[PDB]
Short mmCIF file of C-alpha atoms and ligand atoms in Angstrom, two decimals:
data_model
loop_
_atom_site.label_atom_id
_atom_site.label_comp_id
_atom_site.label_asym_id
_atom_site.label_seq_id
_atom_site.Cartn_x
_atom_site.Cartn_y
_atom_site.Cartn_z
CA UNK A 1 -8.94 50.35 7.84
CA UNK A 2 -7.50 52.16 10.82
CA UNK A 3 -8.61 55.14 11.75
CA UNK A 4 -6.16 57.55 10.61
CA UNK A 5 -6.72 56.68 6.94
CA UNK A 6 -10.69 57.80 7.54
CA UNK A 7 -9.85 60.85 8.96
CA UNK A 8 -6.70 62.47 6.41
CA UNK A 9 -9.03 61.22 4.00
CA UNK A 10 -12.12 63.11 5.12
CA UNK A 11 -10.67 66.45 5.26
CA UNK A 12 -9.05 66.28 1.97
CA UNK A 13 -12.83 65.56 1.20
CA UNK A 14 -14.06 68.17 3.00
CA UNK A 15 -11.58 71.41 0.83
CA UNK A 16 -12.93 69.60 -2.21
CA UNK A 17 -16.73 69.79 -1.65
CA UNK A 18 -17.47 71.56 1.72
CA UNK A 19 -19.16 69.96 5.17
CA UNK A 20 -22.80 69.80 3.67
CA UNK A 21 -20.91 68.03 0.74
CA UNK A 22 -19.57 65.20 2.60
CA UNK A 23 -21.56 61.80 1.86
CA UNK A 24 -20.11 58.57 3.01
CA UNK A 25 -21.05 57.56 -1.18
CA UNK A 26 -17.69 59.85 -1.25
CA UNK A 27 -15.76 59.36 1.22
CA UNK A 28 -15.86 55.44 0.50
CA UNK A 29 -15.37 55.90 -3.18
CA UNK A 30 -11.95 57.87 -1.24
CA UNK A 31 -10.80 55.41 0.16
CA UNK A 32 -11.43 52.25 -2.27
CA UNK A 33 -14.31 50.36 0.00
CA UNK A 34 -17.53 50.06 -0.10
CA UNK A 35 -19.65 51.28 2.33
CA UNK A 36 -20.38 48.74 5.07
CA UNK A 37 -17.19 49.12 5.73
CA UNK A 38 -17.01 52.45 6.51
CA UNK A 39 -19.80 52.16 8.91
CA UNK A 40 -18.11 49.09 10.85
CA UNK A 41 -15.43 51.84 11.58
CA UNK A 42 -17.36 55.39 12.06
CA UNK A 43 -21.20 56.03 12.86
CA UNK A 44 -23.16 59.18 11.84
CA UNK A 45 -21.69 62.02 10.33
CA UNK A 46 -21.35 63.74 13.80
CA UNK A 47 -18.74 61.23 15.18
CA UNK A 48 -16.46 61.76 11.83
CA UNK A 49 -16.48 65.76 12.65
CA UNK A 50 -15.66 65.00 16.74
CA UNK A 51 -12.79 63.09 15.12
CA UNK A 52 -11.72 65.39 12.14
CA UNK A 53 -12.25 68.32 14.40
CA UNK A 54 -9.54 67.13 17.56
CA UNK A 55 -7.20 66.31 13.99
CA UNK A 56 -7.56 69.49 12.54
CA UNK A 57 -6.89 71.04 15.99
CA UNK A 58 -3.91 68.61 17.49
CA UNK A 59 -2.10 69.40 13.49
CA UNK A 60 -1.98 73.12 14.89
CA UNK A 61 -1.38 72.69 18.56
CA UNK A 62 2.35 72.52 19.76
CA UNK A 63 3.14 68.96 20.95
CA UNK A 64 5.16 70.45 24.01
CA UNK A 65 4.76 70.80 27.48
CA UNK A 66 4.04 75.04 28.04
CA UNK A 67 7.11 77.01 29.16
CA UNK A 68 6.76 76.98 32.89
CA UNK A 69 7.47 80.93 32.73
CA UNK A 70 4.21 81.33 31.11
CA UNK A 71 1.82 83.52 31.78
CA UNK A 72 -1.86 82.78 31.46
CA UNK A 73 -2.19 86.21 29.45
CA UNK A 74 0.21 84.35 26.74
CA UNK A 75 -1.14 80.97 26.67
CA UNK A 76 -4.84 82.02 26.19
CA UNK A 77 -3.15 84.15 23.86
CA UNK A 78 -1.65 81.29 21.82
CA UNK A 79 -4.48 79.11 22.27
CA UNK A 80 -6.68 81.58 19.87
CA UNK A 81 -4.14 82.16 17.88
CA UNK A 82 -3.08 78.37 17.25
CA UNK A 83 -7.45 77.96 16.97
CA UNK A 84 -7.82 80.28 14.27
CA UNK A 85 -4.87 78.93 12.09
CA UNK A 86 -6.48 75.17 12.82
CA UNK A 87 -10.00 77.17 12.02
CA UNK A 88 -8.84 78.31 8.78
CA UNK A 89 -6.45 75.33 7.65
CA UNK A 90 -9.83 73.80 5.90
CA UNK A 91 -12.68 74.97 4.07
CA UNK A 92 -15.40 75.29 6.80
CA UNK A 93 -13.73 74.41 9.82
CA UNK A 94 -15.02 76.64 12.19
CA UNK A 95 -18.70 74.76 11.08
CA UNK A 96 -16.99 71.27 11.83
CA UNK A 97 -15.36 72.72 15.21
CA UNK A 98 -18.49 74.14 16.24
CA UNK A 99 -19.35 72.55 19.78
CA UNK A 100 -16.03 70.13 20.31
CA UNK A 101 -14.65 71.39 22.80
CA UNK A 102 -16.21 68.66 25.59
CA UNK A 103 -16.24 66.02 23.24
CA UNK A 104 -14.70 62.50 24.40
CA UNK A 105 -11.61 63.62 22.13
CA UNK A 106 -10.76 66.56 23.53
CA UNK A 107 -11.22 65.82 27.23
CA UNK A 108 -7.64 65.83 27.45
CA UNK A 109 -6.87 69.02 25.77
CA UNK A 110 -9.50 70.65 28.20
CA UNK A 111 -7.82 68.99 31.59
CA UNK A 112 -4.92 70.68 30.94
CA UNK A 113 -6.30 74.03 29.54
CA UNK A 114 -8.34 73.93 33.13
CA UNK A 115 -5.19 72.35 35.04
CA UNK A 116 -3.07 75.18 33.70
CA UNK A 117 -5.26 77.92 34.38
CA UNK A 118 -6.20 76.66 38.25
CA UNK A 119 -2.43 76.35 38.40
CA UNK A 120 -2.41 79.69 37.99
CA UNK A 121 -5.18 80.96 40.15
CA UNK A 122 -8.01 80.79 38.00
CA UNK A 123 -11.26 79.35 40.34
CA UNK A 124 -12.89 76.46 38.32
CA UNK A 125 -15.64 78.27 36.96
CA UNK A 126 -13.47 81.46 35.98
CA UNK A 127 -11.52 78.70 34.03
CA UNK A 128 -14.52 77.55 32.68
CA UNK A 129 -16.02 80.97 31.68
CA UNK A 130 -12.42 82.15 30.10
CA UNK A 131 -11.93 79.46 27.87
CA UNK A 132 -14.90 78.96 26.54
CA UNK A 133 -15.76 83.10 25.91
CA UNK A 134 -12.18 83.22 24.37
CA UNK A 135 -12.88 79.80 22.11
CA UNK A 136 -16.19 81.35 20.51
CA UNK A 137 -14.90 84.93 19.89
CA UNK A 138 -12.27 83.05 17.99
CA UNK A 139 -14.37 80.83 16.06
CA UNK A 140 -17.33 83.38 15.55
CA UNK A 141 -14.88 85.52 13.66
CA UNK A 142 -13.41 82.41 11.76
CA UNK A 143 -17.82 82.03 11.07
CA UNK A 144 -18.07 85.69 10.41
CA UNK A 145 -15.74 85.80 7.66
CA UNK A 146 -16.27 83.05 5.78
CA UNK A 147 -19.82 84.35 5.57
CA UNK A 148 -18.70 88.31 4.41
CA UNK A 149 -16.95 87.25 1.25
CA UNK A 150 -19.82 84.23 0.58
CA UNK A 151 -22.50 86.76 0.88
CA UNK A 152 -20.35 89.75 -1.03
CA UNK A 153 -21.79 87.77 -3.68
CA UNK A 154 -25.49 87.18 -3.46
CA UNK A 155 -26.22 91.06 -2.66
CA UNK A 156 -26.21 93.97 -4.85
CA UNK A 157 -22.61 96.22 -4.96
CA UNK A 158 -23.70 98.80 -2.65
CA UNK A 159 -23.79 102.56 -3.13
CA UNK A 160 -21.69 105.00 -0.86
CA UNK A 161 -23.87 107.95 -1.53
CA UNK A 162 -26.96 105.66 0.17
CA UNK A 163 -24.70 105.31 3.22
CA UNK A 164 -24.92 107.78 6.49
CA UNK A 165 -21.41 109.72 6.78
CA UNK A 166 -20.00 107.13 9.82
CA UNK A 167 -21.46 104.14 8.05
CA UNK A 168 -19.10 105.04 5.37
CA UNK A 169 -16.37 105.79 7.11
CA UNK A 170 -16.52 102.47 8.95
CA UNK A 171 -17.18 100.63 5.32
CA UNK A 172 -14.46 102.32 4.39
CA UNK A 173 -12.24 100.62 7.51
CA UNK A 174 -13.36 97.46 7.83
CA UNK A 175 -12.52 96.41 4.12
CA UNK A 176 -9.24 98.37 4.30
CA UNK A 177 -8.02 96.51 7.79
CA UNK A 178 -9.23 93.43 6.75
CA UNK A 179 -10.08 90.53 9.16
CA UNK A 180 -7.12 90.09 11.85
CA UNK A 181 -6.90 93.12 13.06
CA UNK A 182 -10.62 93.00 14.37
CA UNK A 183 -9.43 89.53 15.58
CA UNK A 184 -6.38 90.47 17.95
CA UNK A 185 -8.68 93.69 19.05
CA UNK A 186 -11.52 91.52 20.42
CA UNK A 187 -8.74 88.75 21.73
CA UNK A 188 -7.08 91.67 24.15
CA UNK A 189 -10.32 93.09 25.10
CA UNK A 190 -11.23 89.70 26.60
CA UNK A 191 -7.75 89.11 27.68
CA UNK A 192 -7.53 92.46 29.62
CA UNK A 193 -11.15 92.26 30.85
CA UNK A 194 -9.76 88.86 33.01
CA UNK A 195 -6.92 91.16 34.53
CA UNK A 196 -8.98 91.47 37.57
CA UNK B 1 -44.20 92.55 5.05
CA UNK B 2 -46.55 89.27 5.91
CA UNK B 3 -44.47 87.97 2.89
CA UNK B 4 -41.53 88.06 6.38
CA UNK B 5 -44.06 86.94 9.03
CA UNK B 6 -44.90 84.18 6.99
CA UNK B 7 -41.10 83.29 6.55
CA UNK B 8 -40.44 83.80 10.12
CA UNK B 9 -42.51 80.57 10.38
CA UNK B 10 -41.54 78.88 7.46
CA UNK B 11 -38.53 79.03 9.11
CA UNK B 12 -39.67 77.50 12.63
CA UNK B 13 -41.40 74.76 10.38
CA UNK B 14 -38.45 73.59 8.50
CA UNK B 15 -35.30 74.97 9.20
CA UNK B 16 -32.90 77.78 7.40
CA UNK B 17 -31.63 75.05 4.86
CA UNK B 18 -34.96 74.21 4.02
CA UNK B 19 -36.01 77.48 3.76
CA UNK B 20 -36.61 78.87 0.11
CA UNK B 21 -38.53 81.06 -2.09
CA UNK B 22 -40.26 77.68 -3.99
CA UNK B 23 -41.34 76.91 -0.49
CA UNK B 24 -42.60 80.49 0.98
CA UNK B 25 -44.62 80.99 -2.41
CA UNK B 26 -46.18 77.68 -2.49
CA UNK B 27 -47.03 78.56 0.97
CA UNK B 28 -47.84 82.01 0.65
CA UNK B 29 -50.17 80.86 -2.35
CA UNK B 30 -49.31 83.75 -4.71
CA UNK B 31 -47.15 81.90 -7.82
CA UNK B 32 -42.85 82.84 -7.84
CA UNK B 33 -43.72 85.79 -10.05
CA UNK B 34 -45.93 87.71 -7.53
CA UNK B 35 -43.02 87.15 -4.88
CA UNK B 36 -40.16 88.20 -6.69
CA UNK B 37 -41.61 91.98 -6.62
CA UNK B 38 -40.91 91.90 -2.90
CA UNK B 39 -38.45 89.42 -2.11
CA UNK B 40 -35.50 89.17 -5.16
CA UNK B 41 -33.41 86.21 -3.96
CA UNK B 42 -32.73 83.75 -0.55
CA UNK B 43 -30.57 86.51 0.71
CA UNK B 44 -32.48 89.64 0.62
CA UNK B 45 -35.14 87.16 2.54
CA UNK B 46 -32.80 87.05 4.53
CA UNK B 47 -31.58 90.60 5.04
CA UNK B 48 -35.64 91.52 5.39
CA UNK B 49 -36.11 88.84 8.12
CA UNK B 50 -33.05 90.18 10.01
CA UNK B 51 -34.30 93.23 11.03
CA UNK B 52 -37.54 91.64 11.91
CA UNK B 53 -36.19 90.05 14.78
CA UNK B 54 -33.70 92.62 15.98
CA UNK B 55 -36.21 95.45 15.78
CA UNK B 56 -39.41 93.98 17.22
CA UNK B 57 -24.12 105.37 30.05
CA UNK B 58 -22.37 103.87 26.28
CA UNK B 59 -21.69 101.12 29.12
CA UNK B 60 -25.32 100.20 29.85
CA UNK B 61 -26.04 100.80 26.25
CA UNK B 62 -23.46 97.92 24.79
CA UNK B 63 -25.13 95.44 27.28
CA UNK B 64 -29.06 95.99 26.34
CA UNK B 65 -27.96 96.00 22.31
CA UNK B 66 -26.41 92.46 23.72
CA UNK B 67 -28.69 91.33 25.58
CA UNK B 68 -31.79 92.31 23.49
CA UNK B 69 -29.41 91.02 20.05
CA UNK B 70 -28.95 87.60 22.17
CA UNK B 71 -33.55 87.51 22.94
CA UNK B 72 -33.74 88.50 19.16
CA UNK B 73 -31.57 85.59 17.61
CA UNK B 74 -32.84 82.92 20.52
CA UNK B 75 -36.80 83.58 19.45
CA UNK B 76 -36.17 81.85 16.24
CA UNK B 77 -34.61 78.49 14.77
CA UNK B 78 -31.48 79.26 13.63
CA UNK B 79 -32.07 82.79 14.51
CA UNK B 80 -27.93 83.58 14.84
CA UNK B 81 -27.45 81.77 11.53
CA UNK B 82 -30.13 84.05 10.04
CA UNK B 83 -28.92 86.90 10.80
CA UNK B 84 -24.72 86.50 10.73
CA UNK B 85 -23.19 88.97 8.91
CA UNK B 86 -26.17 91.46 8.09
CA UNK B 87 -24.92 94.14 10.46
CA UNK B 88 -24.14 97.19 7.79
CA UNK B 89 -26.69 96.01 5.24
CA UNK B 90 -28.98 98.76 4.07
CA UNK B 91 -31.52 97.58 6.88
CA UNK B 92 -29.23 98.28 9.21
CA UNK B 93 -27.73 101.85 8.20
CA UNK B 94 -30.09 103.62 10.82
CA UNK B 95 -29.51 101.32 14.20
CA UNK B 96 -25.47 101.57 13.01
CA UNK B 97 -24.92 105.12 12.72
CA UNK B 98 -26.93 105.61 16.16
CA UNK B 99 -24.74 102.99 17.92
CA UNK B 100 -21.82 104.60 15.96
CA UNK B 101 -22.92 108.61 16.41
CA UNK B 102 -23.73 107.81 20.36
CA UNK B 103 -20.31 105.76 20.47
CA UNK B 104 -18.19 108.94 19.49
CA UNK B 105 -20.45 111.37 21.44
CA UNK B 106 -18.88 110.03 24.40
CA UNK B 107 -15.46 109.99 23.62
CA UNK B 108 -14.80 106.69 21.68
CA UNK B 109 -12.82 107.10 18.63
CA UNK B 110 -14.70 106.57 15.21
CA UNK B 111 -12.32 102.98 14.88
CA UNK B 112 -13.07 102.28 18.35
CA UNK B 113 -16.65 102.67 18.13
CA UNK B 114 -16.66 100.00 15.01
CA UNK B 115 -14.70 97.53 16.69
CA UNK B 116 -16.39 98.01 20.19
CA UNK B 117 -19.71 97.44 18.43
CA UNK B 118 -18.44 94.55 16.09
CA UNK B 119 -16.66 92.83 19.19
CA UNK B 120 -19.60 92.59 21.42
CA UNK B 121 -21.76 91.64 18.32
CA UNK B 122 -19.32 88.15 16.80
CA UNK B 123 -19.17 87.36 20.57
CA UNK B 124 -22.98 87.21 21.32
CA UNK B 125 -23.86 86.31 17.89
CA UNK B 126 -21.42 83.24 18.85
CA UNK B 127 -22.93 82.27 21.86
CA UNK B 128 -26.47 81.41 20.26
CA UNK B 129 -24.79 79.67 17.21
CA UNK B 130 -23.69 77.69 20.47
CA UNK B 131 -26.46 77.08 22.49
CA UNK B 132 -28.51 76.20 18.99
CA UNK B 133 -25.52 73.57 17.97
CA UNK B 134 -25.41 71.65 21.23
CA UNK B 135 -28.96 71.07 21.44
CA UNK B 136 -29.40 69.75 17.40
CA UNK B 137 -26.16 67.69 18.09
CA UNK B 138 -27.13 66.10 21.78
CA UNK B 139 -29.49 63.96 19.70
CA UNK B 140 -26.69 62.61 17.17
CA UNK B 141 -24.10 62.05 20.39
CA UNK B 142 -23.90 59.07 22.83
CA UNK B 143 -24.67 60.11 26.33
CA UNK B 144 -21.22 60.94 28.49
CA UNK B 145 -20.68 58.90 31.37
CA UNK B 146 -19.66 60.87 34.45
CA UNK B 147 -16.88 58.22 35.50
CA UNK B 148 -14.86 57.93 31.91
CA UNK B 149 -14.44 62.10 32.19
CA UNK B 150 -11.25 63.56 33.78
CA UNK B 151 -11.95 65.14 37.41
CA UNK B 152 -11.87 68.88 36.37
CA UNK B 153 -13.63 68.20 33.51
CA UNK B 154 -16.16 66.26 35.75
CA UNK B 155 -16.40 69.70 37.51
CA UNK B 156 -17.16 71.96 34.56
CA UNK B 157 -19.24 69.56 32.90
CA UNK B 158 -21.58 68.97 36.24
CA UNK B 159 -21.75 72.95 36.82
CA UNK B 160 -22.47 73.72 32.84
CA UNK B 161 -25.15 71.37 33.19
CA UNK B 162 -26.69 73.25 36.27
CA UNK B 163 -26.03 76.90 35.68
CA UNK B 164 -27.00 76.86 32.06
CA UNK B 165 -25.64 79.32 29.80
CA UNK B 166 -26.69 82.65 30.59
CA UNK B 167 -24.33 83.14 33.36
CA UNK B 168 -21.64 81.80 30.25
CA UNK B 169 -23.18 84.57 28.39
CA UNK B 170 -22.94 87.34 30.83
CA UNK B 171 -19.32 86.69 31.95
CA UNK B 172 -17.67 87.09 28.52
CA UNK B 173 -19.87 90.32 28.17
CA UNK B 174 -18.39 91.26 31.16
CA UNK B 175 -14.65 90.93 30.37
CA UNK B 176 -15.35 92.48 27.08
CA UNK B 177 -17.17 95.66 28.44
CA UNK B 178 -14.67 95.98 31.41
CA UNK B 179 -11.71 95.41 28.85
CA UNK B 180 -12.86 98.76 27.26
CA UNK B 181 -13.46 100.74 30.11
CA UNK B 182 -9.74 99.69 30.23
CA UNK B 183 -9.04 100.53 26.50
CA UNK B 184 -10.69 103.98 26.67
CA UNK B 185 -9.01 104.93 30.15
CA UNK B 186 -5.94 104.56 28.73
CA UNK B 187 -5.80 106.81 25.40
CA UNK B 188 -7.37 109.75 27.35
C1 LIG C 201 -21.16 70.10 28.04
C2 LIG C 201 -21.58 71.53 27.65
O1 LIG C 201 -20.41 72.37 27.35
C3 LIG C 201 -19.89 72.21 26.10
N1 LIG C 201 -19.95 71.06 25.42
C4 LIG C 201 -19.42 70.97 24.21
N2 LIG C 201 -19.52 69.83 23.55
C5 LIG C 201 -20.28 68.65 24.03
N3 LIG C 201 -18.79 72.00 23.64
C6 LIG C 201 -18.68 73.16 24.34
N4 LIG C 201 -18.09 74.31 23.89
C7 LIG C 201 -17.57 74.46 22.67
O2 LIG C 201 -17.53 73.54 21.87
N5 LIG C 201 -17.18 75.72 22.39
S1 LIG C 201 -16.44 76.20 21.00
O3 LIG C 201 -16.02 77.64 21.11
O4 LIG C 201 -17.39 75.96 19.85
C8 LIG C 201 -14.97 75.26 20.81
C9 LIG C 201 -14.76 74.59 19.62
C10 LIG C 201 -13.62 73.80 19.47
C11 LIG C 201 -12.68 73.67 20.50
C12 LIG C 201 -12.91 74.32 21.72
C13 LIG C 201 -14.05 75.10 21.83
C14 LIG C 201 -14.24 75.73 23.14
O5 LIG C 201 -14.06 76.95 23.30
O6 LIG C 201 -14.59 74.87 24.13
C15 LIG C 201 -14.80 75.67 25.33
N6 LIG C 201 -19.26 73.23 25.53
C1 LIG C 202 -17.71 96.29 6.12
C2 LIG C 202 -18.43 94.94 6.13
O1 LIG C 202 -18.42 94.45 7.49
C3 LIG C 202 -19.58 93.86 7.81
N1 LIG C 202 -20.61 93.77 6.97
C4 LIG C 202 -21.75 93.18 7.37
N2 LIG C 202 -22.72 93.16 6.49
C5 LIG C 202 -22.40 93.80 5.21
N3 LIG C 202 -21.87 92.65 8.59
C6 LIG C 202 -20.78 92.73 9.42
N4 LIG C 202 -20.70 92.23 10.67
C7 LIG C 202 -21.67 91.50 11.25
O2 LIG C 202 -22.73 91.23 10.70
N5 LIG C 202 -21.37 91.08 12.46
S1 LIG C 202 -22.39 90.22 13.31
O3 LIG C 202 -21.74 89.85 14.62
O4 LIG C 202 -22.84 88.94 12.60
C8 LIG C 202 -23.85 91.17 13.51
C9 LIG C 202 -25.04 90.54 13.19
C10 LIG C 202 -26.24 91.19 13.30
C11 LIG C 202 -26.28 92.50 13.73
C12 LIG C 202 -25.10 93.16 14.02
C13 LIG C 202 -23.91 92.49 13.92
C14 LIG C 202 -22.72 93.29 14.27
O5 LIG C 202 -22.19 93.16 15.37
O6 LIG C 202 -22.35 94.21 13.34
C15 LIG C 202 -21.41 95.14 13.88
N6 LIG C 202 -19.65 93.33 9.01
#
């Protein structure tokens, strides 16, 4: 079994029943093996999501060297952009992704997000501090999400009499602009906040 | 109302996935029946112990609701995932229309107000999910050796591990607070 087979095979397990759903009873039944197997090849479920995650994000991530015009405004810009698609390519990604980011796997992506960005005049720790605020904003509102139309659901249909007048008019435009828009916002607060 | 303090340390105890109304009542003592009067499913639980632990210049203003949000969700285990998402439930109506009234008393735009408020909220909100997933997941991960990391991540790695995250928290609120001082000075 090489590697690649575990993985594809994992996240086509993971849409099906979810990251709490993910036993390595089903992942071997899967892939045809039994299970001894499976753990000759991957230990604990934490080093399947490290490997899934880097997967899910390198399926997403261009394969090319940046422009050499760019700007660091644009490729932080990408970066979230190409995050949230890998983010919301698989039912609860943004759970699996969760804490990646200085995993063994992505060491290389993070070299050259830092090499990039200190090419560009970014100190070490402003590199540091950028990246990281602008990978959690993305991912918190790839979390948030998810969790408004789960919990939708489990709560009683509200009443827009019982509301104050700017509660409902903020109701009102939240469900109406749905869930990018709030996205981008937050992305070019951050973005102009580092103009500085 | 001790029905919540007593799930406020149910939760401590055993975790948010462990945490259910079986487990509260046969810990409460009252039977299911009694508890249902206060407490009608796991969410509403969950709205009830939300407030809980966020209750107990518009600059200066954004920054303490941050700051105080980011004490609130750190108190408890799995505080953030507690309380994700719960920000215009009924609870809440009161400490949103103040953020939202005092937001357009001083010249932000209704829309602005919602995603000023919502922005500093996902970000600090994301932050403790953050801090609460690396320390649960340091236990299921083999130790990184220093020599087999790249040199800048070497860097960022060595100063993460000596600054903590609070200065990680405070810089992002930084950039998001000075990105609307930027947002607001140019519209009027
Ligand atoms: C050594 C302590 O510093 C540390 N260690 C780890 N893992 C050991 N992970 C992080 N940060 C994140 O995983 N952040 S993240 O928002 O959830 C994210 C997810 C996916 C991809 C990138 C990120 C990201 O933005 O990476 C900055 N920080
Ligand atoms: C029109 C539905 O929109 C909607 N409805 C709900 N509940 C119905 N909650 C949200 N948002 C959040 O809960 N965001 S939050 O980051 O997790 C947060 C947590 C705790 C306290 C405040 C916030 C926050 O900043 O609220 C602005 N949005």
């Amino acid at each position: 079994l090489d590697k690649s087979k575990v993985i594809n095979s994992a996240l086509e397990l993971l849409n099906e029943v979810g990251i709490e759903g993910l036993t390595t009873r089903k992942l071997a039944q899967k892939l045809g093996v039994e299970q001894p197997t499976l753990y000759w090849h991957v230990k604990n479920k934490r080093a399947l999501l490290d490997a899934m995650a880097i997967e899910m994000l390198d399926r997403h991530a261009t394969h090319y060297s940046p422009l050499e015009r760019e700007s660091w405004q644009n490729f932080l810009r990408n970066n979230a952009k190409s995050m949230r698609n890998a983010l919301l390519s698989h039912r609860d990604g943004a759970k699996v992704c969760l804490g990646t980011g200085f995993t063994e796997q992505q060491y290389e992506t993070a070299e050259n997000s830092l090499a990039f960005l200190t090419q560009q005049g970014f100190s070490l720790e402003n590199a540091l501090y950028a990246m990281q605020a602008v990978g959690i904003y993305t991912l918190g509102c790839v979390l948030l999400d998810q969790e408004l139309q789960v919990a939708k659901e489990e709560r009683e249909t509200p009443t827009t009499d019982s509301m104050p007048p700017l509660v409902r008019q903020a109701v009102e435009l939240k469900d109406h602009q749905g869930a990018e828009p709030a996205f981008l916002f937050g992305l070019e607060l951050i973005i102009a906040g580092l103009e500085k």
